[PDB]
Design a protein around this nucleic acid. Structure first.
Lengths: 91, 81, 226, 96, 150, 127, 97, 25
RNA sequence: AUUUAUUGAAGACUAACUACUGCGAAAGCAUUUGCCAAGGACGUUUUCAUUAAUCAAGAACGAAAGUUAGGGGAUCGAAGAUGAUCAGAUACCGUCGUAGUCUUAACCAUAAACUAUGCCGACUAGGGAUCGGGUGGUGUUUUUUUAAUGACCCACUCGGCACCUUACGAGAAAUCAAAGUCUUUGGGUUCUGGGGGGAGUAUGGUCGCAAGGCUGAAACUUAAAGGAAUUGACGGAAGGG
């Protein structure tokens, strides 16, 4: 059914380590165990192997990315600004 | 005004009003016979059209559309109906 | 305040005018009044080289001074110190700018202001940011009080202005640009471009700023002072 | 727009999805048009370009992925490629 | 009065008194019918079909030219769509706003607007499920709708 | 013909500065202020003290050899009051009546587009 | 009671207006509510005009002016006599003399 | 007194009641 | 130092134009350009056909302040420090200045959140101005004098933000085109109030990280509080003598 109200994956941590620290880890633990979308095949077979190794089982590829999510917002801004300056220089 | 013949008004007042306010609503649009040069292919066209209509020949476009009526191209023989 | 100071020297005269020499600055070939003023600098010891210590300068002077007229009064030219040749030193363009009172005069309400900007390169390796000011206007035979535009008119006016600016300066070199801003052909180009949008009075040009120059090119500068 | 023209062919015409059936049709000459997703192996993409070069068929690249192209045709899976064998009703082959 | 806003606009049509039209067009019911099926056969909607017929042929409105209306005609000649036209457009606009949201998570105006669109969806779906053009157990759900637009 | 300086007056409330310089500006001549003339912290902005400072810098610049000046009037601007103090008109009239020649009066007060923040609270200065 | 009909401001169909700061007190007051005036004043203030004209290198000189808008709060306006209090019948003269 | 400060006096008072009652439990 | 001249960096902000002007469900929204979807009004001889109005429960958004973690961090500035003025002044005024002010992710769910005026529909006095769409006039002006288009003028219309005058009508009055069509009482629906205080307090649930929010009494006390106007008196309020 629905077992727990609000601890989620941090109910394995029990009554320890403080609610706030259990809350913060919760956000990132969800993020790191989830399946994501491979840009190469579109399928939901991307998972973390290790910190910043995100590999897709179906299409057998691996992409470098954030330790806990596969695209970090810092790197997103960098992609966009690289694209701007790259188009400009050949132009 | 105290009294007026609302059952028999003047043509000018019912032409002045909105078309949904007359004693029996009816449209203020119309239809039109139009013919591009060359082939006759005498075609009917609506006033407030929303389309860019032509003749069966080719792109011989007659009425470009606008938010109210449709603006007809320059070389077009057109006529009320 | 003459006797208020609590300390003049926490650390524990000769007249600089006799220590300073005068210099006389000239315009380029693009302005009829060549001689425009003078300036001062310390005597060129071997320690300092007053020539370069003076090279680091710029001067604002009015275009009425530079053209003998009174219609050009409301525009001022900043000319940069780029060459010194034996006490008749020379300048070159740095930037046009209006006088704040003229600008504050044409702006008034119950009209609509429009402004455009371009960041465009010229033919001769400079890169300039030009601006353009336009106002709307009550027609003659009009009776309403304000004459406000409709903002789609404004994007269209902006676009046609900006493309005229880019079109002109891309092909006009710096000296050519200077030579074409004194008559203000740009304004008549705009008004003939825009009379199918809005009547649009007060179409003057506005300031223009070297954002990064090329190499000096002393030959071209001396070519200007032929 | 483009998705409506593709939908008309799905309703009226006929088609085949996927790499294997497409290249089978392309060998036979039976196809008219191919659409290829953009998330796609560039090798497979280029291979289809070669096959369509031989067959003289036309090619179009879809601003989307296999998932997006699949939703367009009205199916509920990933479609990296689709082969139009005949349309009958649409102006798809004529336009674009 | 125009439920999802505060406007009281009345920009409508005014279909005339002449229920037998139009005194100059003397072509046949069968001709306008074959034209209707031709437009519906290239896959047009009844609204656009009547628009086209009106502003290109002499067609005041199909209900007086023929004996009946265009949706009835299409149901009778076998081009009866799976669901109603207006419901189809609401679902299209819904998925559009939904994908806009999923790429731009802070357009709260668009979240609100999506809520109103889906409310309208639900209301017209309830009307259809009560009057049997749709069956009960039908329901807007998101991914199935994204598929159903074709 | 005429040698030119520039007049640069700054007529802030609480002080009216005058100093004269070359057409370029870096060559400075004879900075004097109202507070240099008088004692009391209130008459720093006094137009009398302003004309005093104006006449001395006119004398100094005449004995250095200037003939005319192009005038630039200024006030605080930026965030603050944006309008001059009385020492402006006073100093400009004084140097004008001193006999130095006059050209190109212009206002160059900082008139900022969209400033940062004007001080003294939301409710204001509760004087 | 409601002393006015526009509540001392001009807001209809808005609900909000960005503020402006005054110039004597610098109180954050809205824009529609303020006591905006306009100063268009000759720089010479009409007294030194003769002196500047004679000391000009060039005659027929335009002699420009200071242009500036003046945002006032209600308090500083009333105190400096810009506006003043009006009878219960002459509050409604929405135009000036 | 002013109504706003009446709210502030009660709120500060109220949070003091909360804390002391927390002490017993 | 203050000042003036040539640059540079950082962050915030969007003057003047800016208004009895626009858009938005409300809070709110002002440099340009590009993309993303949305929306109102108008025009319609298109289509469906009563699908609709208002709503306990329930959900979405919700100024500022405030909270959590990153960035950022210039002005301004709760706290705090010093100058004073004062009988006192940790208040006004001055000079510093941390939190904050900006942004990303997540919370908070209030405001004089006001037009103190629920939402939907109808009918009823005039007049002019204005915003958006539409219609008509060999109208004026505009390019190549003159075609279009555009921008103006005139007339009409629908929908808006409001206004000016009356007062038939209403109200306790101020006032109001609704706050009218209510003792000649009934178009449809929702929420709230029953003298002042105690008290939006206590307790109990419930939501929130907290601050706090939603629901929310009683005892006891009192004959008044309160609204709008009239005349006087007063004012470190103005105008005149």
């Amino acid at each position: 059914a629905k077992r727990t109200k609000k601890v989620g994956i941090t109910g394995k941590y029990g009554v320890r380590y403080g609610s706030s620290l259990r809350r913060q880890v919760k956000k990132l633990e969800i993020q790191q165990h989830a399946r994501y979308d491979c840009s190469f095949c579109g399928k939901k077979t991307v998972k973390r192997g290790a910190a910043g190794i995100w590999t897709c089982s179906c299409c057998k590829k691996t992409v470098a990315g954030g330790a806990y999510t596969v695209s970090t917002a810092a790197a997103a801004t960098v992609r966009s600004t690289i694209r701007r300056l790259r188009e400009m220089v050949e132009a | 005004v105290l009294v007026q013949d609302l059952l028999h008004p003047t043509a000018a007042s019912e032409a002045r009003k909105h078309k949904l306010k007359t004693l029996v609503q009816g449209p203020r649009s119309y239809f039109l016979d139009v013919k591009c040069p060359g082939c006759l292919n005498i075609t009917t066209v609506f006033s407030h059209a929303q389309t860019a209509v032509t003749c069966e020949s080719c792109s011989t476009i007659l009425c470009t559309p606008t938010g109210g009526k449709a603006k007809l191209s320059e070389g077009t023989s057109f006529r009320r109906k | 305040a003459v006797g208020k100071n609590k300390r003049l020297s926490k650390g524990k005269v000769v007249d600089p005018f006799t220590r300073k020499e005068w210099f006389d600055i000239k315009a380029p070939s693009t302005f009829e009044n060549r001689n425009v003023g003078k300036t001062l600098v310390n005597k060129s010891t071997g320690l300092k080289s007053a020539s370069d210590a003076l090279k680091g300068r710029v001067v604002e002077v009015c275009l009425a001074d530079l053209q003998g007229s009174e219609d050009h009064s409301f525009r001022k030219i900043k000319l940069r110190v780029d060459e010194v040749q034996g006490k008749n030193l020379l300048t070159n363009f740095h930037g046009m700018d209006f006088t704040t009172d003229k600008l504050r005069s044409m702006v008034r309400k119950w009209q609509t202001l429009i402004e455009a900007n371009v960041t465009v390169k010229t033919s001769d390796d400079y890169v300039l940011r030009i601006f353009a000011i336009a106002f709307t206007r009550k027609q003659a035979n009009q009776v309403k009080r304000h004459s406000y535009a409709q903002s789609s008119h404004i994007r269209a006016i902006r676009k046609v202005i900006s493309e005229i600016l880019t079109k002109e300066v891309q092909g006009s070199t710096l000296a050519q640009l200077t030579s074409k801003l004194i008559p203000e052909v740009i304004n008549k180009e705009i008004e003939n471009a825009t009379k199918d949008i809005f009547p649009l009075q007060n179409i003057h040009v506005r300031k223009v700023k070297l954002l990064k120059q090329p190499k000096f090119d002393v030959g071209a500068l001396m070519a200007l002072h032929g | 727009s483009i998705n409506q023209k593709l939908a008309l062919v799905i309703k009226s015409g006929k088609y085949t999805l996927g790499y294997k059936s497409t290249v089978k049709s392309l060998r036979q000459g039976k196809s008219k048009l191919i659409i290829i997703a953009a998330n796609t192996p560039v090798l497979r993409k280029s291979e289809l370009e070669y096959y369509a070069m031989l067959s003289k068929t036309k090619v179009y690249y879809f601003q989307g992925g296999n998932n997006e192209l699949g939703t367009a045709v009205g199916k509920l899976f990933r479609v990296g490629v689709v082969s139009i064998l005949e349309a009958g009703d649409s102006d798809i082959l004529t336009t674009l | 009065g125009r439920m999802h806003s505060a406007g009281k606009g009345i920009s409508s049509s005014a279909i005339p008194y002449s229920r037998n039209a139009p005194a100059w067009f003397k072509l046949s019911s069968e001709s306008v019918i074959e034209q209707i099926v031709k437009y519906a056969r290239k896959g047009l909607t009844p609204s656009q079909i009547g628009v086209l017929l009106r502003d290109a042929h002499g067609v005041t409105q199909a209900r007086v030219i023929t004996g009946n209306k265009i949706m009835r005609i299409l149901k009778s000649n076998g081009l009866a769509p799976e669901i109603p036209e207006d419901l189809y457009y609401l679902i299209k606009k819904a998925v559009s706003v939904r994908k806009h949201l999923e790429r731009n998570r802070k357009d709260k105006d668009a979240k609100f607007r999506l809520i109103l669109i889906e409310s309208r969806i639900h209301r017209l779906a309830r009307y259809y499920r009560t009057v049997a053009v749709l069956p009960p157990n039908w329901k807007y759900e998101s991914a199935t709708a994204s598929a159903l637009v074709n | 013909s005429q040698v030119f300086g520039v007049a640069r007056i700054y007529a802030s409330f609480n002080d009216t500065f005058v100093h004269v310089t070359d057409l370029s500006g870096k060559e400075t001549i004879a900075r004097v202020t109202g507070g240099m003339k008088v004692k009391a912290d209130r008459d720093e902005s006094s137009p009398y003290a302003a004309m005093l400072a104006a006449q001395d810098v006119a004398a100094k610049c005449k004995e250095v050899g200037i003939t005319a000046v192009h005038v630039k009037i200024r006030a605080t601007g930026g965030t603050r009051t944006k309008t001059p103090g009385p020492g402006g008109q006073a100093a400009l009239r004084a140097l004008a009546r001193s006999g130095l020649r006059i050209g190109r009066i212009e206002d160059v007060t900082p008139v900022p587009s969209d400033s940062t923040r004007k001080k003294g609270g939301r409710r204001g200065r509760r004087l | 009671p409601k002393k006015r009909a526009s509540n001392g401001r001009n807001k209809k169909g808005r609900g909000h207006v960005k503020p402006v700061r005054c110039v004597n007190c610098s109180k954050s007051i809205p824009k529609d509510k303020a006591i905006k005036r306009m100063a268009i004043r000759n720089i010479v203030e009409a007294a030194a005009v003769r002196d500047l004209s004679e000391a000009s290198v060039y005659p027929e000189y335009a002699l420009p002016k200071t242009y500036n808008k003046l945002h006032y709060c209600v308090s500083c306006a009333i105190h400096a006599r810009i506006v003043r209090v009006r009878s219960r019948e002459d509050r409604k003269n929405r135009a000036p003399p | 007194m002013r109504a706003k400060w009446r709210k502030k006096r009660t709120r500060r008072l109220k949070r003091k009641r909360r804390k002391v009652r927390a002490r017993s439990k």
